[PDB]
């Protein structure tokens, strides 16, 4: 049986850890909600 | 029950100890999360009960107590913040510039951050702190890393 616990506020935080790239990927979305790489 | 606006952990006492299965957003009296996290099942908030109201497996979304309330969208140019809520760890903002998922039905923003499976449902925010979508439904690229879509629902 599932339950919820508050983890904090939704706020934009200045000076946060900036990381991660921005790829342009070719994908397909199936009926079950699964994304996949189209090549 | 606790209906305070904010980010929440979705926990289960079914497996060994308490295990975090996902994350969700409370806004305007509605709980927003990903379908694969709860599989439509009812939630407990202290002693209060949250019952599902809307859901869709293809979109991989589900709302509780009311219709989907989140309607902000990524502008296509600005950096965004993933408010990652990882299992057993504190909520942590991480700024990234999203990529693009090119599909036959249109383009979708995508955040290239790698976090445990229990982080599914963590909100992605714009400069004013508005939720532009949820992190948790994506794909694994060539180098084994994880790239999630910026999944946003429709507001009626
Ligand atoms: C358990 C699981 N199940 C799905 C599926 C949801 C519906 C169809 N499409 C994939 N993603 C996952 C997952 O592990 N997501 C995730 C989210 C953040 C970080 C790492 N993994």
Please give a structural write-up.
The complex is a heterodimer of chains A (39) and B (156). With 39 residues, chain A is mainly beta. Chain A contains no helices and four strands. With 156 residues, chain B is an all-beta fold. Chain B folds into two domains: 6-64, Thrombin, subunit H (Beta Barrel); 80-149, Beta Barrel (Thrombin, subunit H). Chain B has one helix at residues 35-38, and strands at 6-12, 19-27, 30-33, 43-45, 48-50, 52-56, 61-64, 80-84, 92-96, 99-103, 106-111, 123-125, 131-134, 138-140, 146-149. Chain B has a five-stranded antiparallel sheet with strand order 1-2-3-7-6. In chain B, strands 9-8-12-13 form a four-stranded antiparallel sheet, with no helix packed on it. Chain B is globular and about 45 Å long. The chains are: A mainly beta (39), B mainly beta (156). Strand 2 of chain A pairs parallel with strand 9 (92-96) of chain B, so a sheet runs across the interface. Chain A: It is found in: Host endoplasmic reticulum membrane. Chain A: Residues 4-39 are annotated as: Interacts with and activates NS3 protease. Chain A: Forms a heterodimer with serine protease NS3. May form homooligomers. Interacts with human SPCS1. Interacts with non-structural protein 2A. Chain A: It is a multi-pass membrane protein.
